[PDB]
Amino acid sequence: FDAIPDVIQAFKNGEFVVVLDDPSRENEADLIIAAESVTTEQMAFMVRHSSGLICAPLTPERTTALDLPQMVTHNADPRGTAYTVSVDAEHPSTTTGISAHDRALACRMLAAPDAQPSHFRRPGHVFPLRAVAGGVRARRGHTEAGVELCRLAGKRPVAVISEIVDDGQEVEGRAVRAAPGMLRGDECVAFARRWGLKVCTIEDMIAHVEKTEGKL
Amino acid sequence: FDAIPDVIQAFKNGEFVVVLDDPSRENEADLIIAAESVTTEQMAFMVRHSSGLICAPLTPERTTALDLPQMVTHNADPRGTAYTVSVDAEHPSTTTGISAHDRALACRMLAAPDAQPSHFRRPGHVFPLRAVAGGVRARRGHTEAGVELCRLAGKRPVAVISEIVDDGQEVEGRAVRAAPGMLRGDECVAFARRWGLKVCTIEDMIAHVEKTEGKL
Ligand SMILES: [Mn+2]
Ligand SMILES: [Mn+2]
């Protein structure tokens, strides 16, 4: 695993970083990137290698500023992922909201300093997620990890995350993939190396933050 | 394009079919399959080749039976896609809700004859979509097309749909894909042929339905 300072620097440079949560939690790795300058081509890569459910972690302050209420008032999961209502970018270049171009645009607009509620059509195809106020020390999820990286790298308080799946194997001429799953542990590290990305754990990220804040 | 009767038969056989809406509308092709027996391996293929936003078109009767209210009360789009609150399957085999296994399971459970509201955790990772009562003749969307195919093929009234994207080209060692987009027209047909699938247009589907119902 890479050291957190090095992950921060890559994140500051607008790169995706690969982040694993605890094996006792989801045991999943997500691609996490700063939303402010995510490119169409980067989004296409993200869609290709992830679940395709492209989320945008942001702070409670941003959910209030942008008027993004929680999708559900009484969450099935109490520590559950805090989905807000979904969005598309209100921009002349948006078409259906699903393309790599459109999803990247929605993410950059969510992160813009002058963002306003009217900049987003609801519902849509990008899924903002409300990080808890206490950050990664309080909730050890990828949502918090993305917002934490934005803070640590001096970026706008909106990230983009999606889970790295195991697409299994192609089966020539057949609309199936054999032995699919989720990418785990070492495979996640191998994926990062293949793509020139830094890779880390939320546990190490928490250890990093604790150097300044102490244990929660 | 294949003739609608032949698309119906493939759909009845549990295959994906490729369906294009009008060029003046989204100009997009979706993979559409019956939800009732979608397999883990099929879902993995769907995720790999689509946007990854896996939706489940269903009737108004099913949204009431399963207690799936619209995600938003005052839709940004008036003829907009009718997203309900998202779901995961309440089943012992579900883990995080995002894997091909978990999403396929949620779809099969939405389609089960004995489905009940409590079978679904909200929010989640599968996106049910409420088809309009008037079917494809009333709203020429993929949501309606999926429900229409279920009716035509004698299946449970729940389909699975997702847009076929153009993932662009891989760039060795770099986390980007060049020239991504949406797959269109002839390319959609080529995609269907490559994968042994039937391919059609919503316009021809409407023409099929009109043979029995007349023009709306
Ligand atoms: Mn996660
Ligand atoms: Mn569509």
Q: What is the DSSP string of A177-190?
A: EES-EE--HHHHHH
Across the A:B interface, residue pairs with CB atoms under 8 Å apart total: 171
- Residue B93: phi, psi to the nearest 5? -85, -10
Amino acid identity for residue B163 in this structure: E
Q: For residues B154 and B14, what is the distance between their CA atoms, to the nearest angstrom?
A: 11
φ, ψ for residue A120, nearest 5 deg? -120, 130
Q: Is residue B102 classed as helix, strand or coil in its secondary structure?
A: helix
CA triplet A200, A41, A144: central angle to 5 degrees? 35
Calpha distance A102→A100 (Å, rounded): 6
Distance between CA atoms of A182 and A165, rounded to whole angstroms? Answer: 4
What's the first-to-final CA gap in chain B, in angstroms? Answer: 24
Please state, in angstroms and rounded to a whole number, the distance separating the CA atoms of residues B63 and A19. 37
Provide φ and ψ at B122, rounded to 5°. Answer: -130, 140
Q: Regarding beta strands A181-182 and A159-163, do their DSSP bridges make them parallel or antiparallel, or are they unpaired?
A: unpaired
For chain A, give the number of residues: 216
B82-98 in b/e form (b: 16+ CB < 10 A) is: bbbbbbbbbeeebebbb
A152 φ/ψ angles, rounded to the nearest 5 degrees: -60, -35
Angle at which helices B4-12 and B202-213 cross, to 10° = 100
User: Å from B94 to nearest chain A CA?
Assistant: 11
Question: Which of A67, A79, A96 should we substitute to test contact with B (largest number of B Cβ atoms within 10 Å)?
Answer: A96
Per the structure block, which two tokens stand in for B53? 């936003």
Long-range contacts of B30-33 (CB under 8 A, 24+ apart): B30/B142, B30/B145, B30/B146, B30/B161, B30/B162, B30/B163, B30/B164, B31/A175, B31/B161, B31/B162, B31/B164, B32/B142, B32/B145, B32/B146, B32/B149, B32/B159, B32/B160, B32/B161, B33/B159, B33/B160, B33/B161
Tokens of B49: 């080749």
Before A123, cis peptide (omega within 30)? Answer: yes
- Are B173 and A165 an interchain contact pair (Cβ–Cβ within 8 Å)? no
How far is the C-alpha of B82 from the C-alpha of A52, rounded, in Å?
20
Q: Which of B144, B185, B139 is nearest to B166 (CA)?
A: B185
Q: Give domain limits for chain B.
A: 1-216
The domain B1-216 having CATH identifier 3.40.640.10: the answer here is no
SS3 readout for A79-131? CCCCEECCEEECCCCCCCCCCHHHHHHHHHHHHCCCCCHHHEEEEEEEEEEEC
- Contacting A residues, span 93-152, partner chain B, CB-CB under 8 Å: 95-96, 98-101, 121-125
- Does A37 touch chain B if contact means CB atoms closer than 8 Å? no
Residue B86 to residues A71, A205, B193, Cα–Cα distance (Å): 9, 30, 32
| DSSP state letter for B35 | S
Q: Which residues contact B212 (CB under 8 A, 6 or more apart)?
A: none
Helix, strand, coil shares of chain B, percent, nearest 5, are 35, 25, 40
**φ/ψ (deg, to 5) at B158:** -140, 125
Q: Taking the CA atoms of A130, A131, A133 and A138 in sequence, report the sign of the dihedral they define.
A: positive
**Residue numbers of A annotated as active site:** 26, 30, 55, 83, 88, 125, 142, 163
d(CA B197, CA B33): 11
Q: Which residues contact A44 (CB under 8 A, 6 or more apart)?
A: A100, B165, B167, B168, B176, B177, B180
Question: Which positions ≥6 away from A182 have C-beta within 8 Å?
Answer: A27, A28, A163, A164, A165, A166, B96, B98, B99
Residues of B annotated as catalytic are: 26, 30, 55, 83, 88, 125, 142, 163
Distance CA A123, CA A111 (A): 18
Chain position carrying tokens 């980067």: A42
Which chain B residues touch A85 with a CB distance below 8 Å? Answer: 71-72
Experimental method: X-ray
Helix spans in B18-141 (H): 40-49, 60-65, 100-111, 135-138
Across the interface, of A52, A168, A180, the residue whose CB is closest to B50 is: A52
Q: Kind and range of the H or E element at B150?
A: helix B142-152
Residues constituting chain B: 216
Beta bridge partners of A162: A31
CA of A31 to the centre of ligand 1 (A): 10
